[PDB]
Write a protein that binds this DNA or RNA. Structure first.
Length: 190
RNA sequence: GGUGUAGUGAAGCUACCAAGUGACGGAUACUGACUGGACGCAUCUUAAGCCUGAAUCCGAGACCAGGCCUACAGCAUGCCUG
C-alpha cells in the first residue's frame, strides 16, 4: 500500500524564520542560526504560511517508513526551532562513592577534563563540539554539576553522552560501583 | 709423518655466547550510546540521521621488490646525435 499523500506539519513561532530549499533547512532565531541538510531523503519539506507559518514535510506515494520519516524530519525541525528560541541545556550530575571526580574545563571552552574518576591515574579528556558551551556550576547551586548548553540538541546531547561514555566503569559489578557523570535533566535555557 | 703435536695467536667469520634496533593512523565488528519516529508514550535504528572505535581489515604509518595505455620501456635531467 502506497498512500497517495502524507503530510506532517510543524507550526513555526513568530520571530523565527525557517528557510528550506533543496531539503537544506536553515533556521534563524534570537538565539542564533542552525542548518541541517536532510538530503538523505526525497521528500518535499516546504514552508507554507504567511500569517501563521508551518513547515510541512510531504511524501507522495510513500510507505509507512516514509510516513514515519516525515514525522522524524518535522521533529528535527521542531528541535531546531527550540534550539533557536529557548536553547537546550543538559545538566549532568556527578556520582561517586569514594573518589571525588574532579572535572575541569580547559583553557578554551573545549576539552572537559575528568581526573580521579575512580582513583584511576588516567585522565579523561573530552573535547566538546564547537557550538556547545560546558560550564561547571558553583557548589552553592548544586555541587558536582556540569551543564552543557547550546542551540543544537544533537551537539549538546552528544557532548553529554561523550562525557558519560568517558566516565564508564570496567571490570566491576556495575550494580555496585555506581560512579559516573549522569544526565540529570534535559532542560531549556529559555 | 697428507696440518707431527701441545701454548698463545692477529685478521676474518661468527654467537641472545657479544652489540644494537623494532612509535602508530584510518575504515570498521560485537557492542555501548545520542537525536528520533513508526506506535501522541517509549525506543541505539529489529527505520532514516548521528557518536565512539577491537591484537581482525587497510595504510610508504614504518618497511621489501619494482615499470602502470599519462607507461611495449613513463617523469626530470647531462652529453652525443639526427
Amino acid at each position: 500500500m502506497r498512500a497517495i499523500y502524507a503530510v506532517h506539519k510543524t507550526p513555526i513561532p513568530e520571530g523565527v524564520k525557517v528557510f528550506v530549499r533543496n531539503r537544506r533547512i536553515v533556521v534563524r532565531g534570537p538565539r542564533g542560526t542552525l542548518k541541517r541538510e536532510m538530503r538523505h531523503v526525497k521528500y518535499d519539506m516546504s514552508v507554507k504560511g504567511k500569517k501563521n507559518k508551518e513547515f510541512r514535510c510531504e511524501v507522495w506515494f510513500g510507505k509507512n517508513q516514509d510516513e514515519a520519516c516525515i514525522k522524524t524530519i518535522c521533529s528535527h525541525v521542531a528541535n531546531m526551532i527550540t534550539g533557536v528560541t529557548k536553547g537546550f541545556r543538559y545538566k549532568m550530575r556527578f556520582a561517586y562513592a569514594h573518589f571525588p571526580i574532579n572535572v575541569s574545563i580547559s583553557d578554551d571552552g573545549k576539552a572537559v577534563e575528568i581526573r580521579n574518576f575512580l582513583g584511576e591515574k588516567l585522565i579523561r579528556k573530552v573535547e566538546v563540539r564547537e557550538g556547545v558551551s560546558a560550564s561547571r556550576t558553583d557548589p552553592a547551586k548544586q555541587k558536582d554539576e556540569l551543564v552543557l548548553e547550546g542551540n543544537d540538541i544533537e551537539k549538546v546531547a552528544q557532548c553529554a553522552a561523550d562525557i558519560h561514555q568517558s566516565c564508564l566503569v570496567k571490570n566491576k559489578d556495575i550494580r555496585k560501583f555506581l560512579d559516573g557523570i549522569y544526565v540529570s535533566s534535559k532542560e531549556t535555557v529559555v
